[PDB]
Design a protein around this ligand. Structure first.
Ligand SMILES: *[C@@H]1O[C@H](CO)[C@@H](O[C@@H]2O[C@H](CO)[C@@H](O)[C@H](O)[C@H]2NC(C)=O)[C@H](O)[C@H]1NC(C)=O
Ligand SMILES: *[C@@H]1O[C@H](CO)[C@@H](O[C@@H]2O[C@H](CO)[C@@H](O)[C@H](O)[C@H]2NC(C)=O)[C@H](O)[C@H]1NC(C)=O
Ligand SMILES: *[C@@H]1O[C@H](CO)[C@@H](O[C@@H]2O[C@H](CO)[C@@H](O)[C@H](O)[C@H]2NC(C)=O)[C@H](O)[C@H]1NC(C)=O
Ligand SMILES: *[C@@H]1O[C@H](CO)[C@@H](O[C@@H]2O[C@H](CO)[C@@H](O)[C@H](O)[C@H]2NC(C)=O)[C@H](O)[C@H]1NC(C)=O
Ligand SMILES: *[C@@H]1O[C@H](CO)[C@@H](O)[C@H](O)[C@H]1NC(C)=O
Ligand SMILES: *[C@@H]1O[C@H](CO)[C@@H](O)[C@H](O)[C@H]1NC(C)=O
Ligand SMILES: *[C@@H]1O[C@H](CO)[C@@H](O)[C@H](O)[C@H]1NC(C)=O
Lengths: 227, 85, 332, 34
């Protein structure tokens, strides 16, 4: 119930964050702005004179003889061709960036939405659980849901515990104590439990490990099933 | 010629990037703003005036690292983040 | 590699210095300065952004405890020391000494300029200083190292939680399929091996055959491009003379116009070629920056199971070290 | 020592190629026979 409530609240805040004025879609807008300014520069480049008498081919042809009108239009042609090759170069340069971005987006799509990814800070920040994509104009939006712990507390810990001259090691947990008694709990959440034979495993004696604490280990078999 | 910015708009600030005129350097390390080279971010603050300072990378911290001492989380939070590509 | 040297060019004086007539002649050509200025500014912005992405990754500045005993393991050769004005590790100092052969110049105040940077500067070829300084970069690295040592991977996923160092290595070996009792029995010898490897790292770096050719390559390429751009000025380009005053006083107007036009076209071609090379270099500069950011995120902030990603073998730890226009990782 | 806790039983001894006859020690019955 609490997890669902938190998820619903988090989903709700996304709408307000997006609908608020400081739009975070700078990436998509940058491409459009770059393309628009490139086309504007290219269309305005036709006004450049390139050392000629006039930028009007009709006026040059009408008010000038072929003997050097040929070279005037020739030079204008060279300048315009230079402009086109420059624009093509800029576009094909940006094409590689677009390809890299698309490849990264597809990789993230596959590795975050089609499954749970263990990679650190790949599908969002934290412990990725699942992801949700949303279509965007010339882009895509991912929604990564992660696990963030809170409210940590401090407990005395030991590497192992010796019981009868032999060291006992936690199976998939840690040894903790906020004082008198000792308990075994999972790493990512506080769930103290009694240290029993099935909770730990024995590995050798208890005079070779540094920091071991001599404590008892409970047998869940003999005291009750003594019949 | 006519571009002089008065006679002394503010205390001229000598920086690694050059000479800064029209802002006052403060000794308060705030979060960054419109940036200047060599780690100077200039900000508009309080009446109101443009000020220059030095970048504050982040809040200082120190983990109480110790023998046999461990921190175990008891609460958890569900976080959703938006990413655009 | 991370970033490459931000530079700016003054087109109007590069095309012709101390020539008012040329200023009017180029004005009739329209605008071949707005776009190259925009491209250079974008390149510099991307350069700063690359460093910010790579290094600015933690919101907290962590400090090591005054006690420097961590399971007997050595960290002196990588921890910064207050015994220097720059709080740099001795490995960082060795790297700075190794790479300081070629640099921006460390001075941009023009006071010492009356002999290589000045020659380019007098042709209107400036260098803009980076936003972040080496002190801030070293502070980032030190905070990252302190948080790593004191917390493990918890600081990389939210609040930093203290954890004993041998315990953390124990869980890490448990993360590669090795039981913790192995470490709890072989801790002394493991620490001895680690310290021996760390010490051997120092002599490997301080030895003559420097392997830091990658960073030097970028600086050499930038320098060579700058020199060839400078030398292209002396070219005749089919003109009569390469001197503006000579070609002006020695020639009549109706021919001097096309004379200047030819040189203008040639130098414009040189400039466009240079800026195109700058963009195509910034391409892999950004690519390498992205790769380095991904590597530091996946190896420093956590333990990676990817084969041959964080070093060779079974990765345990990766320690980052600041480098001039680069970063150095020590894979355990 | 290959005990009951070190292994899990599944199937019989006529479907696996290379299975070897060997004893498995029970850590329950012999000493805790009270
Ligand atoms: C964790 O254990 C430590 C005991 O060392 C306590 O941490 C304190 O942390 C603050 C700031 O982080 C320091 O100024 C104190 O000096 C630390 N206490 C001591 C005794 O040194 C803390 O009380 C414990 N619990 C949590 C949740 O951190
Ligand atoms: C450490 O925390 C545990 C967990 O609460 C404490 O265990 C409690 O012990 C009292 C003692 O009679 C019992 O009444 C409670 O039922 C126990 N709680 C649980 C959840 O089992 C323990 O007292 C704490 N202090 C130590 C171990 O010194
Ligand atoms: C973790 O902390 C949050 C803090 O908000 C707890 O959220 C509270 O949950 C209860 C029960 O659902 C509500 O009555 C409160 O109103 C919530 N807090 C707030 C500020 O609204 C959450 O229960 C905690 N969970 C655990 C497992 O400790
Ligand atoms: C880590 O190893 C270095 C080795 O350099 C220690 O620094 C000292 O270095 C000098 C010169 O190499 C040696 O003569 C000293 O013996 C070294 N000191 C010690 C204590 O070994 C550095 O101290 C070591 N780190 C720690 C925490 O001991
Ligand atoms: C084991 O128990 C003995 C009791 O005689 C004690 O002296 C010793 O410290 C214990 N070992 C530990 C706590 O590691
Ligand atoms: C263990 O405790 C000693 C004494 O307080 C301290 O000097 C040392 O650094 C500690 N070792 C750890 C926390 O790994
Ligand atoms: C074990 O010995 C029995 C004896 O009859 C035989 O039937 C069986 O095939 C043997 N199994 C293996 C794995 O050797």
């Amino acid at each position: 119930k609490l997890i669902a409530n938190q998820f619903n609240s988090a989903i709700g805040k996304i709408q307000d964050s997006l609908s608020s004025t400081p739009s975070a879609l700078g990436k998509l807008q940058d491409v459009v702005n770059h393309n628009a300014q490139a086309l504007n520069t290219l269309v305005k480049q036709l006004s450049s004179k390139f050392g000629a008498i006039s930028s009007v081919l009709n006026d040059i042809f009408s008010r000038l003889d072929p003997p050097e009108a040929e070279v005037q239009i020739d030079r204008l042609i060279t300048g315009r061709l230079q402009s086109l090759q420059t624009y093509v170069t800029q576009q094909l340069i940006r094409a590689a960036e677009i390809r890299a971005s698309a490849n990264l987006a597809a990789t993230k799509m596959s590795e975050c939405v089609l499954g749970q990814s263990k990679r650190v800070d790949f599908c969002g920040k934290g412990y990725h659980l699942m992801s949700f994509p949303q279509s965007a104009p010339h882009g895509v939006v991912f929604l990564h849901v992660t696990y963030v712990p809170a409210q940590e507390k401090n407990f005395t810990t030991a590497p192992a515990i010796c019981h009868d001259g032999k060291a006992h090691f936690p199976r998939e947990g840690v040894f903790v104590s906020n004082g008198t008694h000792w308990f075994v709990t999972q790493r990512n959440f506080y769930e103290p439990q009694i240290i029993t034979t099935d909770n730990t495993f024995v590995s050798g004696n208890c005079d070779v490990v540094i920091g071991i604490v001599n404590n008892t280990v409970y047998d869940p078999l003999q005291p009750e099933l003594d019949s | 010629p006519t571009w002089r910015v008065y006679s002394t708009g503010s205390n001229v600030f000598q920086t690694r990037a050059g000479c800064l005129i029209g802002a006052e350097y403060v000794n308060n390390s705030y979060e960054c703003d419109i940036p200047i080279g060599a780690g100077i971010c200039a900000s508009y603050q309080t009446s109101q005036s443009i000020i220059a300072y030095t970048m504050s990378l982040g809040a200082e911290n120190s983990v109480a690292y110790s023998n046999n001492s461990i921190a175990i989380p008891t609460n958890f939070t569900i976080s959703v983040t938006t990413e655009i590509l | 590699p991370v970033s490459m040297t931000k530079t700016s060019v003054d087109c109007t004086m590069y095309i012709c210095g101390d020539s008012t007539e040329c200023s009017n002649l180029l004005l009739q050509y329209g605008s071949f300065c707005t776009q190259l200025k925009r491209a250079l500014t974008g390149i510099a912005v991307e350069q700063d952004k690359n460093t910010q992405e790579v290094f600015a990754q933690v919101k907290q500045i962590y400090k090591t405890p005054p006690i420097k005993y961590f399971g007997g393991f050595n960290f002196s050769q990588i921890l910064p020391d207050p015994s220097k004005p720059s709080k740099r590790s001795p490995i960082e100092d060795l790297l700075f000494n190794k790479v300081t052969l070629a640099d921006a110049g460390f001075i941009k105040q023009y006071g010492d300029c009356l002999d290589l940077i000045c020659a380019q500067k007098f042709k209107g070829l400036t260098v803009l200083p980076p936003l972040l300084t080496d002190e801030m970069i070293a502070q980032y690295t030190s905070a990252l190292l302190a948080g790593t040592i004191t917390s493990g991977w918890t600081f990389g996923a939210g609040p930093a939680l203290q954890i004993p160092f041998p315990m953390q290595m124990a869980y890490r070996f448990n993360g590669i399929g090795v039981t913790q009792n192995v470490l709890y029995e072989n801790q002394k010898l493991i620490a001895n091996q680690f310290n021996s490897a760390i010490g051997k790292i120092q002599d490997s770096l301080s030895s003559t055959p420097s392997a830091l050719g990658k960073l030097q390559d970028v600086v050499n390429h930038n320098a060579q491009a700058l020199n060839t751009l400078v030398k292209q000025l002396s070219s005749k380009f089919g003109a009569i003379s390469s001197v503006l005053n000579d070609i002006f006083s020695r020639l009549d107007p109706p021919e001097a116009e096309v004379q200047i036009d030819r040189l203008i076209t040639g130098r414009l071609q040189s400039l466009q070629t240079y800026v195109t090379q700058q963009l195509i270099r910034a391409a892999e500069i950004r690519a390498s920056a992205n790769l380095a950011a991904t590597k530091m995120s996946e190896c420093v902030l956590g333990q990676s199971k990817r084969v041959d990603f964080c070093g060779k073998g079974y990765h345990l730890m990766s320690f980052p070290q600041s480098a001039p226009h680069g970063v150095v990782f020590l894979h355990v």
